[PDB]
Amino acid sequence: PRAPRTYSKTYSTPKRPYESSRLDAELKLAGEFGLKNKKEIYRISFQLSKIRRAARDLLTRDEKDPKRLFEGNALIRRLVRVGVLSEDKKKLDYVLALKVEDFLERRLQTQVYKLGLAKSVHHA
Amino acid sequence: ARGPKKHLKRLAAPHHWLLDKLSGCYAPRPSAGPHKLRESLPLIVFLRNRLKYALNGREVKAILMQRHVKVDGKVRTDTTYPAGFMDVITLDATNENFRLVYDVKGRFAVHRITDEEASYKLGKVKKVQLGKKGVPYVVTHDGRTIRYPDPNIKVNDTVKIDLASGKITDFIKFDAGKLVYVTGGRNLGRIGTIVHKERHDGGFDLVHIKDSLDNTFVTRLNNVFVIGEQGKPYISLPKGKGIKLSIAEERDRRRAQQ
Amino acid sequence: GISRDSRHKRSATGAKRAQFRKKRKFELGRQPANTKIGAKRIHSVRTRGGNKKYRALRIETGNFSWASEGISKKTRIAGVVYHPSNNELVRTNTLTKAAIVQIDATPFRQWFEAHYGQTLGKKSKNAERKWAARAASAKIESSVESQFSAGRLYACISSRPGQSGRCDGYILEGEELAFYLRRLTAK
Amino acid sequence: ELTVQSERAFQKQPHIFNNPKVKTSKRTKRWYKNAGLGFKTPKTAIEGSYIDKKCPFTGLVSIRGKILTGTVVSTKMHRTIVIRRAYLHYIPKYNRYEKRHKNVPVHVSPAFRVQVGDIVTVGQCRPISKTVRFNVVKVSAA
RNA sequence: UCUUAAGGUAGCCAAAUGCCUCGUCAUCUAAUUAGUGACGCGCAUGAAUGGAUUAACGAGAUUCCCACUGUCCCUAUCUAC
RNA sequence: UAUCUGGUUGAUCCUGCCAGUAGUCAUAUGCUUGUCUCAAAGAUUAAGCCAUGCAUGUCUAAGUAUAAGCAAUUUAUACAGUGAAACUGCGAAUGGCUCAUUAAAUCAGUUAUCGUUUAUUUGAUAGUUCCUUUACUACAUGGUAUAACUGUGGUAAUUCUAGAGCUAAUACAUGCUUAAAAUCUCGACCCUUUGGAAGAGAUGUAUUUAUUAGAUAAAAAAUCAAUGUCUUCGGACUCUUUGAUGAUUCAUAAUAACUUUUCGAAUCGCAUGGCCUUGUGCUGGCGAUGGUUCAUUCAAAUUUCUGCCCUAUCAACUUUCGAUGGUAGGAUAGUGGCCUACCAUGGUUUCAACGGGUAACGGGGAAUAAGGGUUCGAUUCCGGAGAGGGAGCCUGAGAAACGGCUACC
RNA sequence: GUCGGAUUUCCAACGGGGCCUUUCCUUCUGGCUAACCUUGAGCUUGGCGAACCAGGACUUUUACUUUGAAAAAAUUAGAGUGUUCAAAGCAGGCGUAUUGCUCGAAUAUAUUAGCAUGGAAUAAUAGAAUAGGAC
RNA sequence: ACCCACUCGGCACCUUACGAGAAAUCAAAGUCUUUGGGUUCUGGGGGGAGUAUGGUCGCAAGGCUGAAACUUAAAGGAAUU
RNA sequence: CGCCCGUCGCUAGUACCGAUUGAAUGGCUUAGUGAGGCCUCAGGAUCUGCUUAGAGAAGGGGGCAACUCCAUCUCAGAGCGGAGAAUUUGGACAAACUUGGUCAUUUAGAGGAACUAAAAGUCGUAACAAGGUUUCCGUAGGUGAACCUGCGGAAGGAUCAUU
RNA sequence: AUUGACCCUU
Known part of the structure; x- marks a missing residue:
């Protein structure tokens, strides 16, 4: 048969289904960034955890390691290019300390409201 | 079982063909010929994917059947003819000669050469023996056999062959201090400058090899292919000259000279 | 269907192997x-x-x-x-x-006669010189001569x-x- | 191996000839060879009277491939002995080993006299018998 | 609580002991008042008037199976007296 | 992304499980379901059974066509088609499917073939036959009769097939196409010891018979049974020189015969060239298809080492007659108890042999994992095995083939 | 002193090599003369030798650990690249766009086993004892 | 034979908590989330059940080995009022 | 006036034992019978080549009427051969059945005997207090039933204690 | 010296 086309999940559900603090925080994010579901928040948390795990397994490698160097530059440059990382700090500490709110505010849906084409995030 | 295979599925073709996993569930099984199955580049893939001259196996079949492409001085109108290392693929249209040599990253790359250079080709001898009637002969990596060779030629040497007749024009011995082209393994595609070897009585000799950037590695004696003398190399090299720059260095090179 | 493989045989430890294959052509005997x-x-x-x-x-x-x-x-x-x-x-x-x-x-006897000129059991100048040169070597041993005598x-x-x-x-x-x-x- | 010709057939090196016409010393021609890989041909194999077509040196068998060592545990078989190869098997889960052994049956030429407890090295040859695939090339115990 | 003291325990059973009875169920057969295994308000089983079991043994009684055959279908022939 | 909470009590710490909680290329099912991309899908139970249809055939300029097959031209009366059927060749041994069997078996890395076969591909490679021999035999090159096809058909029936007539070959059997140096026997010669001149038969490959070579790394004199080269016989003696492998009875070469005869082209296409004592003469190109043998490739078959789940309510197992080994032979493409004949009594095992189970094909891998692990892997790749269950075979380079045959159930 | 990329008078540590201190870089013999007694008005016509050769002496027997080739692709992590994002995929990106030019399809190997390789601490295993021990 | 001071080895005991433990308590039940001295055996919620079955030992009684189906949310320990 | 144990009674499940010299399916495995293919001993339809032979009925040159080198339909008599289908000998491979042998996995059973689960059954009161005879262990006997009793043991005792 | 028992849920 043909080669298997690879597919992967892009989100992960929370471990505890009913946490008041988590539910309130996620509803706050949904309301103030105009998101349809909590699956969007789960997806952004999934990507953030992926890149944080990459950064942590990078830091566990010694300094001047070719792998640590190259992968740090790649990850930091990608984060800077998308705009969730600072445009002046390649310390990778911020790479271990990004935020879901930063990713949401970098998303386009709020970008239209920021640049002033929307007048409301739901209009955007 | 019950007899030889004739199909070659994708994801089972050799990786150095750069064949995509989608767009078909088979790959062209290289036919029997001069080179082994794994270390061969069929004319179908060379004229369809490497050169993009033909968009279809049908177009490659038309090209081969009406005989524009001639390999090593012979037309070789086989749609999956095994063209491996050191072969010359000549196209009379546009008068272009390709030398089939690996690039730095272990892939058969395109290599434009002149007509006088495509006239000859180099071949590593695989074994020297005595055929019938007491006639000595040598066999090369290309499956070629040469009768009445120079008595000095031994195993692991290489021969510059006129490629028009069966004569061996020149030959280079395998010795320490010689510029080689490692063919296979992790180091597929490096220029050599041999330093020395470990005999390892019993099999699998390993030679130690430092490229121009003073980087030393180890390869197998059968895995190493000598392509000239220290200083000038017998043939031309593809872009990069086979030095295996590290990934960081390649990143800097790309970002500067995009 | 004379077979030639060792898969029908007891294992070296003495274990009886199970059937793995039908008899194969490439492992036949005649x-x-x-x-x-x-x-x-x-x-x-x-x-x-x-x-x-x-x-x-x-x-x-x-x-x-x-x-x-x-x-x-x-x-x-x-x-x-x-x-x-x-x-x-x-x-x-x-x-x-x-x-x-x-x-x-008998062809061996004839060859020895024409080659050495020596009798078994009970002419030209070239023939004589050849026989003389080849002689002093027809004393092989008792039993070859005895076999020749018995025929x-x-x-x-x-x-x-x-x-x-x-x-x-x-x-x-x-x-x-x-x-x-x-x-x-x-x- | 008290006498060479005990069997119903006549034992001799195939295609090795001893011309009877010439009668000088050493009437019988014995063929030997060195096996390579640094192994030395024993004087017993050089000057012996046995035939033993399975010898590495005087026999028609050729040694190539694996080379192992072990202490023989059985000499109660004609011209073949069994060596014990003792090794440790690693188990990652428990991060330690167990003692494991493998008995490999080997053919020992009359050039070597071995007993249980001797440490002999053997080399791979073509299948000699149903189970024997190696030949003794040295002994390291006395 | 009564009759004359007790009130059939452990076991075993249509048993060589069960009338009804060719008991009922299962099995064995094409078909079984037969045989075996169960059941048990057992007319009227049962503990040295010994109960139950039991290898071995038996010219003891019975059922089935294989082998074998003139017992038979179905008779025929031969020998001696 | 190293996390817990509810439940034994009047209440408390525990143990301990139950319950919750999250995931699942884990299925099923319920209710619901608007768009885009992507996509598994009769594995589980029954490797149970199958109606019907299809899934293996094939052509070039270049192996055979006089088809009561089609469309038909001339700057040369010294030769231009497409071709259904049927021979011939090749393929049908790939693919695809499934996971029944299978627990040192398969399989995974690792080796070996100095222990083998190999269509095809690629490169190279065949001047010695006329064998009761100066002719039973054509090489400006030969026979057999066999398909298609034509008449009658035999039965209900099959991809059933007969008797007669022609006719092909790349179907089958014989058969020949040179003026090459060079050894062994047969000799008239003088009764020889440097003695040599006439002319014959064998010397291709396949002969897997026997024999020889395939050597080597270090300074003198020597009568011997037979001078070898030059040689005032009083003496100088040079020229011997053959490869690889870690390793060979290795590749090759040579010597004596055997072959019931293998091969060494009675085969096709292409516009036609040059030479002339202009003869339907001599010479000649580019190819196709065959073809010894050797390498090469695709392969195959064996094979070294190490590694597999549960079970001791499996402790001994194998061993008339194969179990372990030795000798010899048969068979194989080869090695080998693979099988025979003789002999020895060996071989495995608590470091778990042997036996049993597996709702077990193995691996790449998957799910979940702080680390360490647990569970899964019929299933897109690789390797096995099978075609309803065994078994035996033909053809073929390759099958113990099943959209091949035979037989039993 | 180099507009975050210093050839240096760095006098502080770390990791390796060489020699001597009773402490050996497994030898008996030649050629390319070799850590060479022989230098040319400045690449020597005479010893040692294993970074290479042979007949005796071996990786003192291992376990262990270091490094190296292999452990197919797909899968995994991971560089890239606006598939309109994404899962994916291995595509693509730029001209004096008449002509055309052009990058990439990398990087870890998944117990163990086998092969080489440095070490030899730790844990085993032998040597010379009625000397049939060593030079 | 006693009395003193030691010493080695025993059966123990009193005190305390460096510690340990759920606690009762423990000089070992300590040196164990700062987890590794060597080694043997045993347990994995409560029942069914030390039952059934197979094996083996025994004269027997029984011993050793030893399940599952099924069932159940507690059984249980140490303390407090 | 707590709790609580066991017979007995009722209801429903679950395994276990069980005559049937049970049954079925496979794996190997005394023997026997044994299809078919393959090798082999023969066999031989049929097809098909070679020769100095004899003629019944044509013959042609030679002085063609007392003789012929070859002969048309041609064969019944001869020998040399090649292939060779049925059939068939002995084998070797071996499919499918029987009585045996276990092994493994299923499965039918009259009946028997346990266990378990049930809001409110009967009989007693064995345990928890010194539970009113302290409990419990091993063993043995007895008994409607919990249980009682003997012998030894334990404290998990109701005693850490007699100078 | 005798002293047995006291339904289900809450």
Whole structure:
């Protein structure tokens, strides 16, 4: 048969289904960034955890390691290019300390409201 | 079982063909010929994917059947003819000669050469023996056999062959201090400058090899292919000259000279 | 369906193996030729990749070599006298490799006569000079001369009739001859 | 192996000839060879009287491939002995080993006299028998 | 609580002991008042008037199976007296 | 992304499980379901059974066509088609499917073939036959009769097939196409010891018979049975020189015969060239298809080492007659108890042999994992095995083939 | 002093090599003369030798650990690249766009086993004892 | 034979908590989330059940080995009022 | 006036034992019978080549009427051969059945005997207090039933204690 | 010296 086309999940559900603090925080994010579901928040948390795990397994490698160097530059440059990382700090500490709110505010849906084409995030 | 295979599925073709996993569930099984199955580049893939001259196996079949492409001085109108290392693929249209040599990253790359250079080709001898009637002969990596060779030629040497007749024009011995082209393994595609070897009585000799950037590695004696003398190399090299720059260095090179 | 693989056999530990494959063509065996003497009969048998074999059945004559004299001539086989494998083959006169047979050895006698000019048992200038030069070497040993006198030389089959279709052999000389003659006389 | 010609057949090196016409010293021609890989041909194999077509040196068998060592545990078989190869098997889960052994049957030429407890090295040859695939090339115990 | 003291325990059973009875169920057969295994308000089983079991043994009684056959279908022939 | 909470009590710490909780290329099912991309899908139970249809055939300029097959031209009366059927060749041994069997078996890395076969591909490679021999035999090159096809058909029936007539070959059997140096026997010669001149038969490959070579790394004198080269016989003696492998009876070469005869082209296409004592003469190109043998490739078959789940309510197992080994032979493409004949009594095992189970094909891998692990892997790749259950075979380079045959159930 | 990329008078540590201190870089013999007694008005015509050769002496027997080739692709992590994002995929990106030019399809190997390789601490295993021990 | 001071080895005991433990308590039940001295055996919620079955030992009684189906949310320990 | 144990009674499940010299399916495995293919001993329809032979009925040159080198339909008599289908000998491979042998996995059973689960059954009161005879262990006997009793043991005792 | 028992849920 043909080669298997690879597919992967892009989100992960929370471990505890009913946490008041988590539910309130996620509803706050949904309301103030105009998101349809909590699956969007789960997806952004999934990507953030992926890149944080990459950064942590990078830091566990010694300094001047070719792998640590190259992968740090790649990850930091990608984060800077998308705009969730600072445009002046390649310390990778911020790479271990990004935020879901930063990713949401970098998303386009709020970008239209920021640049002033929307007048409301739901209009955007 | 019950007899030889004739199909070659994708994801089972050799990786150095750069064949995509989608767009078909088979790959062209290289036919029997001069080179082994794994270390061969069929004319179908060379004229369809490497050169993009033909968009279809049908177009490659038309090209081969009406005989524009001639390999090593012979037309070789086989749609999956095994063209491996050191072969010359000549196209009379546009008068272009390709030398089939690996690039730095272990892939058969395109290599434009002149007509006088495509006239000859180099071949590593695989074994020297005595055929019938007491006639000595040598066999090369290309499956070629040469009768009445120079008595000095031994195993692991290489021969510059006129490629028009069966004569061996020149030959280079395998010795320490010689510029080689490692063919296979992790180091597929490096220029050599041999330093020395470990005999390892019993099999699998390993030679130690430092490229121009003073980087030393180890390869197998059968895995190493000598392509000239220290200083000038017998043939031309593809872009990069086979030095295996590290990934960081390649990143800097790309970002500067995009 | 004579098989030749070891998968039907008990394991080296003594365990009985289970069935893994049906009998395979590439692991087959075939029946013996059981070559005999008289009215030479050869049947061709097709083997893997062509490679025909000649199953010798009832082969009449063979080619025998005297190694000391460096000669070989076609000879008739009188009969099997000893076989280290099976005495039944001796009793039946069956031709296999390493089987000792009696031969007429008349072409050997004629060759020795024309080559040395020496009588057995009881002319030109060139012939005389050749015989004189070759002489002083016709004292091989007692038993080869005795075999020549009896007219039946001992020779062992060194070929495989059921494979090559020829009962080729060589004459026993020296320690080998003494060994087999001792086996023959001891009973 | 008290006498060379005990068997019903005559034992001799195939295609090795001893011409009776010439009668000088050493009437019987014995063929030997060195097996390579640094192994030395024993004087017993050089000057012996045995035939043993399975010898590495005087026999028609050729040694190539694996080379192992072990202490023989059985000499109660004609011209073949069994060596014990003792090794440790690693188990990652428990991060330690167990003692494991493998008995490999080997053919020992009459050039070597070995007993249980001797440490012999063997080399791979073509299948000699149903189970024997190696030949003794040296002994390291006395 | 009564009759004359007790009130059939452990076991075993249509048993050589069960009338009804060719008991009922299962099995064995094409078909079984037969045999075996169960059941048990057992007319009227049962503990040295010994109960139950039991290898071995038996010219003891019974059922089935294989083998074998003139017992039979279905008779025929031969020998001696 | 190293996390817990509810439940034994009047209440408390525990143990301990139950319950919750999250995931699942884990299925099923319920209710619901608007768009885009992507996509598994009769594995589980029954490797149970199958109606019907299809899934293996094939052509070039270049192996055979006089078809009561089609469309038909002339700058040369010294020769241009497409071709259904049927021979011939090749393929049908790939693919695809499934996971029944299978527990040192398969399989995974690792080796070996100095222990083998190999269509095809690729490169190279065949001047010695006329064998009761100065001719039973054509090489400006030969026979057999066999398909298609034509008449009658035999039965209900099959991809059933007969008797007669022609006719092909790349179907089958014989058969020949040179003016090459060079050894062995047969000799008239003088009764020889440097003695040599006439002319014959064998010297291709396949002969897997016997024999020889395939050597080597260090300074003198020597009568011997037979001078070898030059040689006032009083003496100088040079020229011997053959390869690889870690390793060979290795590749090759040589010597004596055998072959019931293998091959060494009675085969096709292409516009036609040059030479002339202009003869339907001599010479000649580019190819196709065959073809010894050797390498090469695709392969195959064996094979070294190490590694597999549960079970001791499996402790001994194997061993008339194969179990372990030795000798010899048969068979194989080869090695080998693979099988025979003789002999020895060996071989495995608590470091778990042997036996049993597996709702077990193995691996790449998957799910979940702080680390360490647990569970899964019929299933897109690789390797096995099978075609309803065994078994035996033909053809073929390759099958113990099943959209091949035979037989039993 | 180099507009985050210093050839240096760095006098502080770390990791390796060489020699001597009773402490050996497994030898008996030649050629390319070799850590060479022989230098040319400044690449030596005479000893040692294993970074290479042979007949005796071996990786003192291992376990262990270091490094190296292999452990197919797909899968995994991971560089890239606006598939309109994404899962994916291995595509693509730029001209004096008449002509055309052009990058990439990398990087870890998944117990163990086998093969080489440095070490030899730790844990085993032998040597010379009625000397049939060593030079 | 006693009395003193030691010493080695025993059966123990009193005190305390460096510690340990759920606690009762423990000089070992300590040196164990700062987890590794060597080694043998045993347990994995409560029942069914030390039952059934197979094996083996025994004269027997029984011993050793030893399940599952099924069932159940507690059984249980140490303390407090 | 707590709790609580066991017979007995009722209801429903679950395994276990069980005559049937049970049954079925496979794996190997005394023997026997044994299809078919393959080798082999023969066999021989049929097809098909070679020769100095004899003629019944044509013959042609030679002085063609007392003789012929070859002969048209041609064969019945001869020998040399090649292939060779039925049939068939002995084998070797071996499918499918029987009585045996276990092994493994299923499965039918009259009946028997346990266990378990049930809001409110009967009989007693064995345990928890010194539970009113302290409990419990091993063993043995007895008994409607919990249980009682003997012998030894334990404290998990109701005693850490007699100078 | 005798002293047995006291339904289900809450």
